[PDB]
Structures are given as C-alpha cells and as structure tokens.
Amino acid sequence: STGSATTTPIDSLDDAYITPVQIGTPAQTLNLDFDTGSSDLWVFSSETTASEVDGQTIYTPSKSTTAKLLSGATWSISYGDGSSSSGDVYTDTVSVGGLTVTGQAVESAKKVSSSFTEDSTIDGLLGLAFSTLNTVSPTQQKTFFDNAKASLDSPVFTADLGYHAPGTYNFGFIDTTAYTGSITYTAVSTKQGFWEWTSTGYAVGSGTFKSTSIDGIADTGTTLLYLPATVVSAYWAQVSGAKSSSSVGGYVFPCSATLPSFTFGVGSARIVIPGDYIDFGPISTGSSSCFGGIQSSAGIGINIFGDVALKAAFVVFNGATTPTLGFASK
Numbered sequence: 001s002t003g004s005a006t007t008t009p010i011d012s013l014d015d016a017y018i019t020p021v022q023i024g025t026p027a028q029t030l031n032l033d034f035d036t037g038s039s040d041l042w043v044f045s046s047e048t049t050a051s052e053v054d055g056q057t058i059y060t061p062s063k064s065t066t067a068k069l070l071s072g073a074t075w076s077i078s079y080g081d082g083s084s085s086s087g088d089v090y091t092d093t094v095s096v097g098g099l100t101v102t103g104q105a106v107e108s109a110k111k112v113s114s115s116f117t118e119d120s121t122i123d124g125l126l127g128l129a130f131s132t133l134n135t136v137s138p139t140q141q142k143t144f145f146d147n148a149k150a151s152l153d154s155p156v157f158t159a160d161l162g163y164h165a166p167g168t169y170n171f172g173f174i175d176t177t178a179y180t181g182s183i184t185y186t187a188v189s190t191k192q193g194f195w196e197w198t199s200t201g202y203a204v205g206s207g208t209f210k211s212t213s214i215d216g217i218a219d220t221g222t223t224l225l226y227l228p229a230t231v232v233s234a235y236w237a238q239v240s241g242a243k244s245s246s247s248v249g250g251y252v253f254p255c256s257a258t259l260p261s262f263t264f265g266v267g268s269a270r271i272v273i274p275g276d277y278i279d280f281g282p283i284s285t286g287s288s289s290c291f292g293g294i295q296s297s298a299g300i301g302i303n304i305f306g307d308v309a310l311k312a313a314f315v316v317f318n319g320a321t322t323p324t325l326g327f328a329s330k
Contacts, residue, residue, distance in 0.1 A: 001151045002172035003099025007034065007161065010121040013280055014307060015223050017161060018121060019169055022095040023106060024064030030057050030123035034169055035221030036159070036195055036317065037304070039133035039143050040077050041094070042085055042107035043124035044116075052112050055120030061108065067092045075107045075135045080222070080300065083115040089136055094144060096126075099171050101148050105134075105141035125221065128157065128317065133193035145171070145319060155319045159220055160330070161311035163277055179314035179328035184269035188323045192302075194219070195317060197325050199305075200267060202227075204235050205260030209270070216303030218310060218317070218325055224280070225262070225273070225308040226297035235262055235294050242292070248283055251292040255282060262294060264309060266327040273312040 007017040018031040023043070030043055044053060046060040061067035067090045076086035087110035094104040109124070116122065127134070131142045149155045152172035160178055161167040168178070189196045194217040201211040214227065232251065236242040238260050242253035253259070259275030278293035293308040316326030 001099055001148070002153055002170070003095075003097035003148075004168060004170045005097030006166050007169055008166045009162070009164065010119070012164070014161075014164060014311065016122065017167070017220070017307070018123075019096070019126070021126060023059050024061070024092050025066040026064075027095070028057075028059055028064065030059060031121065032124050032126040033122050033221060034126050034128055034159075035219070036128040037217060037219035037221045038077065038079065038125065039127040039129045039131055039193065040075060040107050040135055041105065041124070041126045041144055042075065042077070042087070042109055044112070045087070045108040047087060048109045049111055052117045054117050057123045059106065059108065059124075061090045061092065061106075064092055066102075067106075070105065070136075070139075070141075073105075073136050073139060073141075075137070077135045080304075081115070083113045085109045085112040085116060087111065089141070096144065096171065097169070099148055099152075101144055104144055104147055105136060107136065128220070129195065130190050130193045132190070145317075148172075149319055157317050157319070159310060159315045159317065161220070161307055163274075163311050167311070174316060179330045181329055182269075183314070183316060183326040183328040184266045185316070185318070185324045185326045186266055188325055190323060194302075195323070195325055200265030202231055202265065203263040203270075204238050207238075209263065209265070211265075214264075214303055216297075216305050218315060219304050219306050220310060222304045222306030223308070224304075224306050225294045226300055226304040226306065227294060228303065229296045229298045232294055232296045235260070236292065244296075248289070248291070250295040252283060252289045253292055255288045255290040257290075264305075269327065271309070271313045271327055271329060273309060277308055277312060
C-alpha cells in the first residue's frame with residue numbers, strides 16, 4: 001500500500017504545516033501537524049477542557065463505531081517549545097492520503113497548554129519519530145508509520161515541504177518526479193528516538209564550505225533551523241545590523257536586509273537554503289526588526305534541522321531495519 005497527502009502552511013510565515021487525517025467511522029477529518037520529532041498522535045477532542053478549545057476541530061470518539069477506549073492508558077507530553085498536552089487513549093481507524101491503519105492509538109487530549117489553544121489551525125499532532133518516544137503509559141504505543149510499515153510497498157515516508165506553498169507527505173514510495181538530481185543517503189542514530197544524523201558542514205552565501213560534523217535531528221515539527229552558536233554567529237555576521245537580542249529571544253535583523261543563503265552538507269552533497277527562507281518577518285506588527293530563521297541551539301541540548309532546512313529539500317525517512325535519511329535538491 002501507499003498514501004499521499006498534501007500538507008499546507010498554517011500562515012504566511014510557514015510557522016507549521018497541517019495535513020488532513022481521517023479518524024474513525026464515519027470519518028472525522030482533523031488537520032494534524034506531522035512531527036518527525038515526536039511519537040504521539042494526539043487530538044483535540046470532545047474530552048478536551050472546554051475553556052482550552054478555541055476554533056479547533058475535535059475528535060468525538062462516541063460518534064465513531066470503530067473507536068474503543070484503551071482501558072487504563074494515559075499520556076502526557078512536553079515539547080521543546082515549552083508546550084504540553086495530556087489525556088487518555090482510544091484505538092480507532094486512521095487514514096492518511098488513502099493509507100489506512102486499523103487499531104491506531106489516538107490520544108485524546110483532556111488538557112492542552114495555551115499555545116495549542118491559541119492556534120486555531122492545528123487540531124493535534126501526528127508523531128513520526130521512533131515509537132520508543134511514545135508517551136502512553138503503562139503500555140507504550142506505536143506511531144502511525146510504525147503500524148503501517150509492514151503493509152507499505154517500501155518502508156519509507158517522504159517530506160516535501162513547500163516555501164510559502166503546499167507540499168506533500170508520501171508513505172510507502174519515493175516520487176522520483178519530486179526532486180532534481182540524486183538522493184544522498186546518510187546514517188541515522190535512533191539512540192535518542194529521533195531521526196538523528198550528522199551533517200558534513202556548512203557555507204554562508206557564496207562563501208567557502210566549512211567541513212565540520214554537525215549532529216542534529218530532522219524535525220518537521222520545529223519551524224526554524226537551530227545550530228551551534230559558532231555556525232549561527234558566522235551566518236548573521238554577513239547581515240549588516242543583525243544581532244542577538246536577549247529581549248526578543250534570538251537573532252534579529254533589519255527588515256531592509258537581503259539575506260544570504262545557507263548551505264548544509266549531506267555527505268558529499270549540498271542543500272542550499274535560499275536567503276528568503278530565513279526571513280520570519282517583523283518581530284511585532286509594524287516593526288522594522290525581523291526575526292531570523294537560523295538560531296542558536298545552545299541550551300536546547302541538540303541541533304535541529306527544522307522546517308527552514310527541510311523545506312529546501314526532498315527528504316526520505318527510510319524506516320528499513322537500519323534506518324537512514326535521504327536528501328535531494330528540488
């Protein structure tokens with residue numbers, strides 16, 4: 001089997017992407033944030049505290065003839081951005097782009113933090129990291145991909161995120177029309193539960209490539225590119241007037257600037273992030289200070305190849321017995 005679904009930016013900045021997901025019978029379609037940095041499929045629901053729901057579409061398990069309470073199971077998650085959610089668990093039928101999993105754990109939120117409430121466009125998350133990170137207790141549950149894997153034509157999914165445009169998540173096949181040149185594959189460590197890999201270096205603009213190993217995670221659920229302070233300083237030093245602002249929470253730059261590109265290495269291959277992808281616009285409405293899309297990972301504890309990086313590439317998440325990651329230009 002295979003599946004193919006379009007993923008759409010939630011706003012004009014590409015802050016996140018939502019993908020329609022069918023849950024239950026008859027189908028209830030919710031727009032979920034596919035997150036290769038976590039491993040829980042959780043949804044706003046009829047059980048979510050009423051004051052914490054503001055415009056989201058909810059899953060109502062009592063209206064699904066295939067929903068079953070997973071008795072005794074609870075979940076609770078905290079994300080890198082300080083947001084969180086928790087609740088109980090149902091199993092139900094879940095379909096993405098024509099690919100159906102029966103008995104998928106659907107984690108129903110009883111509580112969500114303010115960041116989730118305030119974002120009307122995201123009805124929940126669909127985790128695509130390794131199932132060892134799943135938070136369901138006392139019986140850990142499998143991700144949608146892990147459940148689908150054996151049925152797929154090939155044990156892979158791909159992320160093809162757009163810049164200010166829709167893109168695609170495919171399951172079970174590689175669309176050879178969706179990228180240019182060849183795909184370069186690189187080793188993955190699953191030791192921390194992430195799609196963790198090592199970039200071979202970077203360049204700023206038309207500058208020379210610096211060969212240096214940068215360990216990080218491929219994370220579709222993180223907006224920005226978070227890299228070591230040395231690398232980030234070298235980038236922003238090429239933008240007149242750019243500076244790190246403790247009050248704002250990272251590097252800012254004059255909105256009048258033209259940003260240089262940023263290149264990262266994948267083996268001997270190179271992915272170029274155009275300068276425009278690094279612009280996250282005014283820090284507040286009407287400001288002439290703009291927020292940068294490359295930020296320091298210092299104090300996160302890990303480097304993160306988030307959407308800023310991934311949307312410059314066609315990315316293969318290869319879930320074979322020994323997982324790997326592939327990157328192609330597009």
